[PDB]
């Protein structure tokens, strides 16, 4: 009469609350026992039932109590189910149906409780439900800004199921894949050596290739771990990705460059994929009294010993070198202009190396709006002679 249950339901991407979680409450009477689930109410008891199919079924998000010959229900706090008026004695709590984009897990579907004599204090339990939570980051960048051909450190993140290794018959889950999606001005470095190959870890041990497949669809790649050694997983833990991607001839300062990722278990996934974007930057200058025949290079530094910008011709990869021989020469032609783009963000200095030749640098800030979009390019900034 006035012993009750107090659930809480959980996923275990966020341990965050989750309704529409249902159960049903069962218990055992009798040598051998025989099981019985609560079906309704008669004359201010719940009655029971031998058949699960009549079972009620208890939902997360609402409350249950004794009312005049059926359940009076309430609405509960998110992944709270309550269920008062329980008479003494032991009993199963069983799950018969996750929430949506969650998974059963299997050590917690049938949940024991017991309802002591004299007794109003609520019990209460947790349950868990398996959903999933992806993380893309990039772990090294002191921002956002990056130059093409630049190799960037991504890692891509999830929880590993706590019922990854649960069987149907015939397994839980029979497969377990990350999946990134990003613009065709990033590619992926497939790379499986080196300073730049990429790695898949459960918590910290890495995963031998063997139990992995990469493969790569059109401008994405997937990561698949292989059917047999799915169960080996960390229950709980974290499976992670940690790869390479540069941005390529494509890519211009005018975008951005976003890349997103989520997971393919059969099961559930993030529904708000995680995505990170990166720029790059780049300046425009016009020469004027326009003038064809100016020459420029670009330094990191207002010095003589300062590096010197290099554009290579084919990846438009933007590097450093020590030497005036080594760097890229930008010539004016007869609309003026000298076009620098592919930078990381931060200040440098425009040198004429080729009317009167300049005495001194020009310094120029590479930012977020040092360039602009494709419909509204900033106008270049005027250097007269
Ligand atoms: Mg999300
Ligand atoms: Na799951
Ligand atoms: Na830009």
Redesign the pocket.
Known sequence: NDGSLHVKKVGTAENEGLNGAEFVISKSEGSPGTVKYIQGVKDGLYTWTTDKEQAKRFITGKSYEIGENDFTEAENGTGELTVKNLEVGSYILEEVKAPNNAELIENQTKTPFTIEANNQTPVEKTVKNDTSKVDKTTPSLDGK?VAIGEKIKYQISVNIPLGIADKEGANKYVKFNLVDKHDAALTFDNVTSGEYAYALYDGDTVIAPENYQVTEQANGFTVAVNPAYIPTLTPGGTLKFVYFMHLNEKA???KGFKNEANVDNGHTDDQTPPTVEV????KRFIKVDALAGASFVVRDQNSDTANYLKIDETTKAATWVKTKAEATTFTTTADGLVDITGLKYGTYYLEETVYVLLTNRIEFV????????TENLVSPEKVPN
């Open positions: 800004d211009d300062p005018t720029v790059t930057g780049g590479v930012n977020e709006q040092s360039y602009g979009t």
